[PDB]
Design a protein around this ligand. Structure first.
Ligand SMILES: Nc1nc2c(ncn2[C@@H]2O[C@H](COP(=O)(O)OP(=O)(O)NP(=O)(O)O)[C@@H](O)[C@H]2O)c(=O)[nH]1
Ligand SMILES: [Mg+2]
Ligand SMILES: [Mg+2]
Ligand SMILES: [Mg+2]
Ligand SMILES: [Mg+2]
Ligand SMILES: [Mg+2]
Ligand SMILES: [Mg+2]
Ligand SMILES: [Mg+2]
Ligand SMILES: [Mg+2]
Ligand SMILES: [Mg+2]
Ligand SMILES: [Mg+2]
Ligand SMILES: [Mg+2]
Ligand SMILES: [Mg+2]
Ligand SMILES: [Mg+2]
Ligand SMILES: [Mg+2]
Ligand SMILES: [Mg+2]
Ligand SMILES: [Mg+2]
Ligand SMILES: [Mg+2]
Ligand SMILES: [Mg+2]
Ligand SMILES: [Mg+2]
Ligand SMILES: [Mg+2]
Ligand SMILES: [Mg+2]
Ligand SMILES: [Zn+2]
Lengths: 14, 88, 129, 104
RNA sequence: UUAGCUAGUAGGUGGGGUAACGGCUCACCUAGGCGACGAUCCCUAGCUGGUCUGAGAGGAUGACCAGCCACACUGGAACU
RNA sequence: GGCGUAAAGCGCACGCAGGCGGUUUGUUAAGUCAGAUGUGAAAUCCCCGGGCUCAACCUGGGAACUGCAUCUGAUACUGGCAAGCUUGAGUCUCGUAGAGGGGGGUAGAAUUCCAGGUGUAGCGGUGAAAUGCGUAGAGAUCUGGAGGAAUACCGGUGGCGAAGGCGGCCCCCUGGACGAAGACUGACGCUCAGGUGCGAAAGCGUGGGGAGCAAACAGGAUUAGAUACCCUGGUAGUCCACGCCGUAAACGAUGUCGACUUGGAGGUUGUGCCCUUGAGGCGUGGCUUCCGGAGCUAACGCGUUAAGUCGACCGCCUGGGGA
């Protein structure tokens, strides 16, 4: 949910 | 922490007057004498893990207050680290 | 904590507008005056006063229609976790041009309607819908 | 420790060296008596056939009824008492299996 | 379910070297270099201008056209 | 896009790196924005055309290529520096409450064992019985002693602790929480991947300890069989020291912090004033439960302690089964 979380690891596409 | 004679004297040791009690250097000395007071307690009472939380609170509190004086004025920092025996 | 004080300002406006409050108070600053004075000049609110100099306290007078919310909703856009910036031709509109978008530039705080004659861009503050 | 295990499955067919077939059986601890009336329980025992129609009444529970000639044959010793105590244990088992209901 | 990797390695002197700067090469001197902003190891893949899809943001890929790099049975080397 | 119950909030806490940050002024122009240059090959796509009888297709110029580099600008916001300020977060004093932890003593019931006395045919146990105990006198009662573990009543959606949890009394050592009056430092803060410690009980290692309860097991009923249930016994373990193990339906099935948004019934804990005119009247903080409006929600329900409206940061989930 947090944009700063996605800096470390993006959303994992299946 | 301590009694009235131990608290008020160390404030008069490191403070400019009796009113200089809220400053950071006094707060280091309040934690320095308290950890030195609890050296022989936790050696005998290693199974007191609940009072160790109060001990680790004051070690973490003293580390944060040393980081404020070091980043602003290092002249007062180099005085207090050897005057109380820090940096190990 | 109070790390986004503009978002704290938008919280205190949106609550008392919906909960039929007559007037609200909040801690003042320079930037909060530069937003509420623009909203005073855009018909959304009524009046603002300053109180206290060692503790600056801002006050806002609410505004209603028949007991109905004038400011229906307001949306914080940029934030300390994610900064938002646009150019002079990428300025977004609110409700296709009905609502205003508070954008602070080097020529002070103005709207995107007022940024057409100014020709500048910068930080989006809030979507006054 | 004091029990037996049913390892072999239901039934496997083989042949005798002379003639006929064999059928193995499972290790079974079950008793299905949902079939018929307790009149057929009286017919389920060989030597009790020749002693029917000798009691007092035309209908008889043979446990709590006075003058049961089947009970007189057990008391005489021509029928062992192990079979008679197990006989009404079958009838009292129908007082406990029947309880909920079951029908084909 | 890859956390330590690396001794010509990192830097300096001098000699040598190519068309040009340079550990490009050699002796000596220093013990550093790289790395949780992914070093290193393993697997996969030519890349890009684009094509296709999608309201857009994105998504999948790199045939024909064009640009570049690599390769010419396998491996190594030099001449002209 | 979600994480109270549909899959999902690590059991909890500390804290580095990282992200983020109250308020006032100056400065730098870093980020950003404005303008301009150079560049972003052609072809493809888009705009208007032209051409092949038409279309496909070819093609003129323009736009597009939201890119990158440099210069000149503006200073509101973000960043850096400088000086600050006090409401955030801290420090002192006076106090009050509490099963907070550790260590060492100590009390009295009850259980069982043992000693003695009086005393006699059953005690014991269950739906009903039996195993078991007892004429060497059980059981019951009384006196006296030993050992072990737990703390009735108080005691209650009561209190405390980060959580698991924590309960006789007393001493010693020691931790945080909260309130009143001011004084004082001046953002010293929030949050947390690795790392670090605590962490129900079972079980594991070494050495003690042994009442009661009690896996496995002994024995008797039950039964089709009893392995379980029921009953009579009984070892490991439960106890302590010293470690290790680190998982739970470790649950409020809600990560932490802060800002606001109508209210009641109470509880607990203080404090300020008041014909003290009663343990009361009036206020006002801390903690906590049940109702309930707006609002939210898939429904249940939440509803100033949010699951209402928002910000700061982190963890985690992506059909069921495999797992
Ligand atoms: N001493 C002895 N053992 C015997 C005798 N008969 C059989 N056994 C043993 O008894 C055991 C049981 O035999 P088994 O035939 O397997 O029994 P089962 O009834 O077939 N079992 P299941 O119910 O699985 O089919 C075996 O170990 C067998 O050797 C005998 O006469 N004497
Ligand atoms: Mg205290
Ligand atoms: Mg050289
Ligand atoms: Mg070709
Ligand atoms: Mg090619
Ligand atoms: Mg969904
Ligand atoms: Mg679920
Ligand atoms: Mg939890
Ligand atoms: Mg082109
Ligand atoms: Mg062209
Ligand atoms: Mg074209
Ligand atoms: Mg035509
Ligand atoms: Mg006792
Ligand atoms: Mg001051
Ligand atoms: Mg063991
Ligand atoms: Mg049992
Ligand atoms: Mg043990
Ligand atoms: Mg688990
Ligand atoms: Mg519940
Ligand atoms: Mg309602
Ligand atoms: Mg409610
Ligand atoms: Mg799966
Ligand atoms: Zn008869």
């Amino acid at each position: 949910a947090t944009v700063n979380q996605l800096v470390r690891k993006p959303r994992a596409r299946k | 922490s301590l009694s009235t004679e131990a608290t008020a004297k160390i404030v008069s040791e490191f403070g400019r007057d009796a009113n200089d009690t809220g400053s950071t250097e006094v707060q280091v000395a309040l934690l320095t004498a308290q950890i030195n007071h609890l050296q022989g307690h936790f050696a005998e009472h290693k199974k007191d893990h609940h009072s160790r939380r109060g001990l680790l609170r004051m070690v973490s509190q003293r580390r944060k207050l040393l980081d404020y004086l070091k980043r602003k004025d290092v002249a007062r920092y180099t005085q207090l680290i050897e005057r109380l025996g820090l940096r190990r | 904590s109070m790390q986004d004080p503009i978002a704290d300002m938008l919280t205190r406006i949106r609550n008392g507008q919906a909960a039929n409050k007559a007037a609200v108070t909040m801690p003042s600053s320079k930037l909060k005056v530069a937003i509420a004075n623009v909203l005073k000049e855009e018909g959304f609110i009524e009046d603002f006063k300053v109180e206290g100099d060692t503790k600056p306290e801002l006050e806002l007078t609410l505004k209603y229609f028949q007991g109905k919310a004038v400011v229906e909703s307001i949306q914080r856009v940029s934030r300390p976790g994610l900064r938002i910036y646009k150019r002079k031709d990428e300025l977004p509109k609110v409700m296709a041009g009905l609502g205003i978008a508070v954008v602070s530039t080097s020529k002070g705080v103005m709207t995107d309607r007022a940024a057409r004659q100014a020709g500048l861009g910068g930080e989006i503050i809030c979507y006054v819908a | 420790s004091g029990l037996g295990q049913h390892t072999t499955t239901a039934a496997r067919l083989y042949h005798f060296p002379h003639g006929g077939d064999v059928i193995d059986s499972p290790g079974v601890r079950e008793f299905g008596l949902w079939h018929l009336e307790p009149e057929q329980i009286t017919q389920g025992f060989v030597e009790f056939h020749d002693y029917l129609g000798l009691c007092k009444y035309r209908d008889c529970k043979h446990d709590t009824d006075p003058g049961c000639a089947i009970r007189e044959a057990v008391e005489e010793g021509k029928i062992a008492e192990t079979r008679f105590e197990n006989y009404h244990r079958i009838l009292e088992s129908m007082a406990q299996v029947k309880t909920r209901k079951n029908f084909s």
